[PDB]
Structure formats: C-alpha cells, structure tokens
Design a protein around this ligand. Sequence first.
Ligand code: NA
Ligand code: NA
Ligand code: NA
Ligand code: NA
Ligand code: NA
Ligand code: NA
Ligand code: NA
Ligand code: NA
Ligand code: NA
Ligand code: NA
Lengths: 162, 162, 162, 162, 162, 162, 162
Amino acid sequence: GSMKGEPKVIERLNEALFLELGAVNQYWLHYRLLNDWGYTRLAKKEREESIEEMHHADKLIDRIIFLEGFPNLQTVSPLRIGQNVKEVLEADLKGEYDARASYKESREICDKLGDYVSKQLFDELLADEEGHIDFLETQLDLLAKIGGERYGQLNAAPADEA
Amino acid sequence: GSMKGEPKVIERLNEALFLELGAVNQYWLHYRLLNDWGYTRLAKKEREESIEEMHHADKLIDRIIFLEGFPNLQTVSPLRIGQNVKEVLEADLKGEYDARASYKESREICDKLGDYVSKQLFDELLADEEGHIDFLETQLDLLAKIGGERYGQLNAAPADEA
Amino acid sequence: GSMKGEPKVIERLNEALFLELGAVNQYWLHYRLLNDWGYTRLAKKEREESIEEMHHADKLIDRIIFLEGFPNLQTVSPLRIGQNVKEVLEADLKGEYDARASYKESREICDKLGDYVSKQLFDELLADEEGHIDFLETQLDLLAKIGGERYGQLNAAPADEA
Amino acid sequence: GSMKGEPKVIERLNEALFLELGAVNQYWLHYRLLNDWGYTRLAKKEREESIEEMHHADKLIDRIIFLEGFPNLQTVSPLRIGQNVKEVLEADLKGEYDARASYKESREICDKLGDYVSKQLFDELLADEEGHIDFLETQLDLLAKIGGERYGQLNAAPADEA
Amino acid sequence: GSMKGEPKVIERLNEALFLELGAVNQYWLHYRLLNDWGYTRLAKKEREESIEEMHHADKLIDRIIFLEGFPNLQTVSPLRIGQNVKEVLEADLKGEYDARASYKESREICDKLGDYVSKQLFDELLADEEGHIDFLETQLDLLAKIGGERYGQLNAAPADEA
Amino acid sequence: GSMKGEPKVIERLNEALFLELGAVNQYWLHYRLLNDWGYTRLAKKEREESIEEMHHADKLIDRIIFLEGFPNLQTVSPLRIGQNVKEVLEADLKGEYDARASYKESREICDKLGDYVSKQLFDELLADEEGHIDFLETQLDLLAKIGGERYGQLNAAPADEA
Amino acid sequence: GSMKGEPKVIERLNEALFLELGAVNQYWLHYRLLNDWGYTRLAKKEREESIEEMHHADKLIDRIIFLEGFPNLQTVSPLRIGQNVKEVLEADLKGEYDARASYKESREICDKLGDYVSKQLFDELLADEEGHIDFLETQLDLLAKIGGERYGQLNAAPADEA
Ligand code: NA
Ligand code: NA
Ligand code: NA
Ligand code: NA
Ligand code: NA
Ligand code: NA
Ligand code: NA
Ligand code: NA
Ligand code: NA
Ligand code: NA
C-alpha cells in the first residue's frame, strides 16, 4: 500500500495552491488599500477573507504532502488590484470565478482517477468559493442600486473609530 | 352541548388561514431576496414578520380544530413578490390590507352568528395587522422623503457584518 | 463568469421546494391534530419535524436565488392528512419516500450537469430524509408490536401536563 | 354619575357566580375522589381547575360589588359527581357547557344594556371556559381511543410517589 | 386600501384627548396642592394617576395619527380643582364620570362605523376609568365612615419622612 | 417505498464491519502489549484508535440495520499482531491500507447502485482512514530517522507516572 | 507638503517585502513538512515564525502605501526548502542573513535620503531578524553537540499528543 498520489492530482492541488496564494495576497493588499482609502469596514472583511484563503492554502499544502508530492509556494497567481471600491470587488469576483472553475475541473479529475478524498477537498473548497461569490455579487448589486458613493460611506468608519 | 362550529365561521377561519399562509411565504421569500440584494436590516425585519404571520396561522388552525372543522393548508393566497425595496414594501402593504379587510368582515360574521370567541380572535388579528400597516406605511413615507437609495443604504449592513 | 444556474437545476430545486412546503404544512397540521387528540408527545415531535422541513425549504430557497432563479412558494405538494395516530405516521412516511426519490433523482441531474454544489445540497437533504424514514419506520414497527392503543398511551401526556 | 348597575346585569353576574361556586366545589370533590381512587395526575389537574374557577368567582364578586349589587354566595349550582374517571370528565364537561351557555347569554344582555365592561368580563370567562371544554373533550377523545383502563393508568402515579 | 379614518372617529378620539389632557393637569395640580397641604400619601397616588392619564393621552394621540388625523393638544378640558381633601376626590370622581360617559359613547360610534380597533381602544380606556372610579368611590366611602380629619391623617406622612 | 437495501450494498457494509472489528481488536491488543512493554504513550494512542474504530463499526452496524440487512459480528478480520514497537506500527498500517482499499471499492459499488447515502458513509470512513495512514506513516518516518530505541523512549513514560 | 516617498525608499521597502513573502512561505512549508516528519515541536515554532514574518510584511505594505507607492505582492524571493531537520534550520538561517543584509543596507539608504521614519522601520526589522538569527544559530549549535537524532527526538511529540 502507498499514499503516493497520482501526479495529475498533485498538479491540480498545486494549481489550486497557486491560485490560493494569489488570492491571499490580493485580499491582503486590498485590505491595506481599502483601509488607507477610509473604507475601514470593507477592509476588515477583506482581511478576514485573506485569512479564509490562507486556510484553504494550508489544507492544500497538507494534502499534497500526504500524497508525497511537493507543494510549490514559490509563485503566486496573477493579482488583480483595484483602484477604487467597485474595482476591488470586481477584481475579487474575477479571482473567485477563476478558483471556482479550477476546483470544478479538479474535482472531476480526482474523481476520474479514483482519489475520492482529494475530490472531497475540492468539493469543500468549491462550496466555500461559491459562498464568497454570493457575497461579492450581493455587494456589487447593492453598490449599483444605492450608488458607489453611498456604498463607500456605508463601508467607512467615522473619524473617532477609523 | 357541542363545540361544532358554524360552517360559515370555519369558512372565514379557513379564508384567514389561506391569506396567512400566503403572507408567511411572501415575507419569507422577501426576506431571502432582500438579504441577497444586500438590505440585511430590512431582511431581518421581514423574517420576523413572516414568523409573526406563522403565529397567526397557528392560532387559526387551533381554533378550526376546536370548532371540529378541517384546516386547509393545501393552498396559499396569491403572492405579491417585489423586485426592489419599494415594491417589496408596497406588496407587503397590499397583502396587509387584504388581511385587514378579510378579518373585519370575519369578525362581523362571527358576531352575527353568536361565536364571540372566534370574533375575539379576528379582533386580535385585526389589531395586529393594523399595527403592521402602521409600520409599512411609515417605512414607505420615510422612503419617499429621504429617497429610495438612501432608504436602501439605511437598511443595508456594512460588508464586515452583512 | 456567471452564477446563472442550469434551468433544469433550478427546476429540480423548485420541485424540492414544492415537496418541502407540503411537508412543513402536513407536519404542522399533524402536530395540531395530534395535540387535539391527546397525543402530546408525538405532537411535539411532529412540530419539531415541521421546523426541520422549514430549514430544508430555506436552504433550497437560498440556493435558487444564488443561481439567479426564482423560488416558487405559491403552491405546495399534495398533503396526506391522517385521521388516527397510525395513519399520521403512514402519511408522513409516504411523503418522506416522495422526498427521498425526488432528491435522489435531483442529485443525479445536478451531477450530470456539473453543478456539484447543488448536488451536495441534495445529498445532504437525502441523508436527512433517510434519517427521518428510519425514525418513522421504527415508530410504525413499535406500534405494530405493542399495539396502537398502547402506542397512543405511550405518546400521550397525563392530564396535569397535557 | 353613578356606578349603580342595571338590576338585570347584577342578576346575570349572580347567575354566573351560582354556577362558578358549583364548579369550584365539583372540581374540588372530584379532586379528592380521584386522588382516593389512585388517579393522582388527573386529581392534581382537577384541583388546579377548581382554583381557576375560584378566580372566576372572585372576579364576578368584585364586579357585583362595584356595581353596588349584593353577591350571593349562599347557594351553589347543582353538582354532577362522577363515580369513575370517565363520568368525572363527562360531568365536568356538562358543567362547562352550562357555564358557556350562561356567559354567552350574559355577554349579550350586558351589551344590549350598555354595560360594556361587564360584557368584557363575560367575554373573558367565555374564552376561558371554551379552553377548558377543549381540554375535557380532548381527554375524553383520548380515553375512548386508548381505552378507559389505559387512560386511568396514564393518569395514576406509581406507589412510591402516589 | 387606506388607513384614513372616519372623520367622526377622529373627532371622538380628539374629544377623548381633550378630556385626558384635562385629567393629566388636574391630577398633577392636585398632586402639588395635596403635597403642600401635608397629605403626602394621597399626593403620591394623585401623581401616579396623572401619569396613567398621560399614557391614555399618548395612546389616543398615536391612534389619531395612524388614522391620518391631526391630534389637538392646544386645549384641555375644564379643570375641577378642590380646596380640601374631600373636594379633590370629588373633583377627580366627576372628571372620571365625564371620561366614562365620553368613552362609552365613543366605543358605540366606532362600532357603528366599522372601526373595531378604535372601538377596542375606547373599550380598554373605559375599563381603566371604571377601575379608577372604583378607587375614588372607595376612598370617599372610607372618608365618610372614619371622618375627614382621620382620613387626612391616614394619608399624611410624619414630619421625618414628609 | 422501501428501505430494503441492495444485497451487494449490505455485503460491502458487512465486509467493512468484518475489517472494523479486526481493527478494534488489533488496536486493543496492541494497546495492552505496548503498555506491558513500557511504551505507555503509544499505548494510550493505540487505545484511542481502537475506540475510533468502534465508532466506525457502530455506524456500519446502524446503516446495515436501516437497510433491513443483518450485521455480522460473529467473525473478525485477520489480526496482525506486532512483537516490537515498529512491527506494531507496520501491522496497524497494513490494516489501514486494507480498510482504505475496501472502502474505496465500496463507495464505487454504492454509487453505481444508486445508494448515495451509503456511498457517503464509505466516503467519510475513507477520509478517516487516510488520516490515520497519515499518522502511522509519520510515526514510522520519525522512528526511522531518530532510531527505534529513541522512538521507544519518546513514547514511554517515566516510572513515577507509568 | 507631501508624503510621496523617495522612489529609492519604496524600492528598498518592496525589496524587503519580496524577501518577507519568501520567508513567510518558506516557514509555512517548513512547518507542514516538519509536522509530517514527526517534529511537531519544531513545526509549531516554525509556524510561529511564519506569522512573525507576516507581521513584518504587513508593516512594510502599510509603509509603502503611506509613501504613496505600490506594494508588490506578485513575486516572492527564492525559497530554500530543507529535506531534514538540520537542512531546514540551515535554510532558515540563510534567509535570515539575506534579510539582515538587505535591511542594513536599506536603513542606510533611508537615512541618507532623509526618511528617518522608514529608516526606523528597517532598524526594528533588523533587530528582530538578529534575534531570530540568535535562535537559529543556538538550535544548530545544540544539534551539533547532542547530535541530529537526539535533536529530532527532543523536538518530536509522543504519539498520544502528536
Ligand atoms: Na479559497
Ligand atoms: Na447617506
Ligand atoms: Na397576520
Ligand atoms: Na357588538
Ligand atoms: Na426535508
Ligand atoms: Na460521481
Ligand atoms: Na369558570
Ligand atoms: Na384616562
Ligand atoms: Na476505521
Ligand atoms: Na522578518
């Protein structure tokens, strides 16, 4: 018996890790920019989401090592950095769709190759990303309906607690 | 002695139940839509009002069974589903006026037929619906005065607590 | 990228919602009847199960809206209303088998169409319904073995706590 | 201005008091008999119901004195005393129907004569009696369905807590 | 649908408000006079009753606004100000009878015009006023039986707690 | 509707139970041997793992009964009993690989036959066994790197707490 | 007045960030490898040090944004990944010396250009890195003196708490 994973499974896991490290760093930078712009409420959520992506990355790393593969943390996927509140949300949403599409294909490859526990891991990440797509599309819907300046005000703190 | 109710009283009670199940379901769907649109504060109130209508439905069911009638939960009254915040409030208000008018006529029929305890039940529901008409007309007054986009912002949560 | 679901997936979700609203209402009416008949212990469980079905309905509604579909709360599936304790259990069991069969087919359609998160939702509901089929078949087994009158007594409260 | 009530209103109030003192005493004796027969659970409920009828009697006495009438506590309405559990419930039910019919007629006379606060008092007692008719008819339904001996066992305590 | 009340209903509500503001002010002045005269116990009750009348006034104001009428707080009904303890009680009693008679007629007009929730409000105020007529007639009965000077002493505090 | 499972599904469930009872007993005996040899820390973990396998066996038994099959607890799979610390870990690892391979094939058969809830149960056990394979391969890696005598010392308690 | 930093200062800050993201990822992977190898005590320290490097990265990001520069999180410095405990410590030490040398040069450039607050930030990071060089050189000294296998045993947990 051996836990040596399928090379294609470890590749999909590393591709997920590539995207996850990009998302961690994009959310963390969006956090710092949003805070510097005054949108301290959205910034706090952005930092929470960076941390959620760190947990995803950690689960992927752990699974690759268990499959006796080598996790690649040397590179991170292309960042999309926004220059105003709406661009930040739109950039996050595009990265979420990239993750969604990647994990859907990955769960299918793991299933086809008989690695059902890795398949399960991609199924859990897929559900998590769809939840965050929910959130981001809701925020962009709200921003369109009440307008960007009111959306920014709603997500800014007053000066005595900024 | 017999608790067998007047057929016309059980009919009025079932007509109230018909409307009440419609209101439960309309408020619950309005809850889920409002939340998905970002108006998490109005959504929470909408869900509270759905639950209040469930309690009305439950009292009606209990009274019909006590009168040895058969409660009908198979059908629900026509739903009015809004597509923006103002339409949601307007749709709820129309259903409240339907309930108000139905319960006013029902208290009169129960009184005429000598079922004063059923009459009392319609009197309590009538007062409750008028309270909710108060609330909805106040919210629509506020929305007209400060404008729909500011009313939406007021009833939305920031992103770190949405 | 788009969260617009497959029309056939939203149809299966709405078909589940149709059945779920029927189950909510059947369990709630069975609750009120059982209580009126004196079987206050079985009534309390029936009301708990109605609430469990409300949570199922709520998850389905939320998923349909996320897929940008329109949840239908206007109609509810045909109710089976029992006229004694055993008929109540038998009627609930038939509705559970309807839900089981519907969700099994739905998980297969979602899987075939590539909506694995909706598939997951049907998988969780399927497990939940099978648990309730377990319970109902156990209760009907007990009722057959100790007899209906002893089963009724076991599930009735004494008069000072009824 | 004068609080001197209508003679016919005080008569209806005294007629209610007549019935209420009969119900107090019938429930209290049924309590002591049921306990002596071993049905300690039903006995405890019977004693609770005697006390509920004492509160009704007290409200009637207070209202008669406020109307400057003279409450009659010299006589009590005919008691119906059962000789087994089912007869006790049937006897209580007959007295409840007597009270119900009396209070319905009394609320109508008070209303016709313009004493709306006395009318209200009869409306509250009417609702209370209908609740107790609910309870008694439920218990008699249960007794018929599981049988009198099982109903007695259900409402008896074991010997170490009788 | 419209909550625009019947003009005659708003008139009755405003007539009640007229009397209620008079009662508030009469009880508050009677409070201050009684205290200045040394009857600190009766004064405290008088101030409590002023506050109870404020709550009545507030309910009336709220109902008029809900009916889309305009509450009139510009005028207050004629005050009856006593110059000794017995005159204070007699003056309060006369105002209570005025309120009682006004609310009885008002509940009848609201009922006739189909505004059963306003009718209910007058029914609740009517019961409340009859309770206070009870109290005042009891106090005047006591004052006649033990004599005015003993009644005054009973309702005065000693000098170290006056 | 019927919960009568596929005969091949109950066979796979019973095959899992066969292996699980073997693992329970192998871990429990390894516990007692390790303790007797002085390796009280590894012994405590071994006993914890026996109990984890008991929970697996219990879930399988429950599922077989729900499918109206008959759980077989008469036989247990071949035990591999080690005679030193490294052999104990190697023997546990071989049994874990047997369980892993059995559950992977079983999830595939349940899926093919349309029993997705039984499939889910094998998916959860599969993930659990892979976690324990992780642990055992890590311990064997550590034992090779620091040497068996140091690994034994690390997993022994001092004499005043052995 | 303007907070627009010197381009060369932002370059040094971004060069520090480049190294810091490499250190975060190297420590996090070393954490997961060490844990998988059984050295759970050293793994926990490695994860703590990854987090310390995250705080350094965060301070650098914040300072770059304050200087109106653009933080680069797209690339990370070359990782040195060890394949046994001693190589892990040696690889961490080499990265620490790279950071030390980079921050020493950076504090000198910031000082020369008159950005004393950025200079201060490099001075604080420099002190922090020298503390971690202290730790790593101490651990490598200990490993040489007691031997690698005893150093590994010392930094491994027993099986009941691994
Ligand atoms: Na993620
Ligand atoms: Na605003
Ligand atoms: Na209602
Ligand atoms: Na009337
Ligand atoms: Na369900
Ligand atoms: Na599949
Ligand atoms: Na009574
Ligand atoms: Na008043
Ligand atoms: Na197992
Ligand atoms: Na650092």
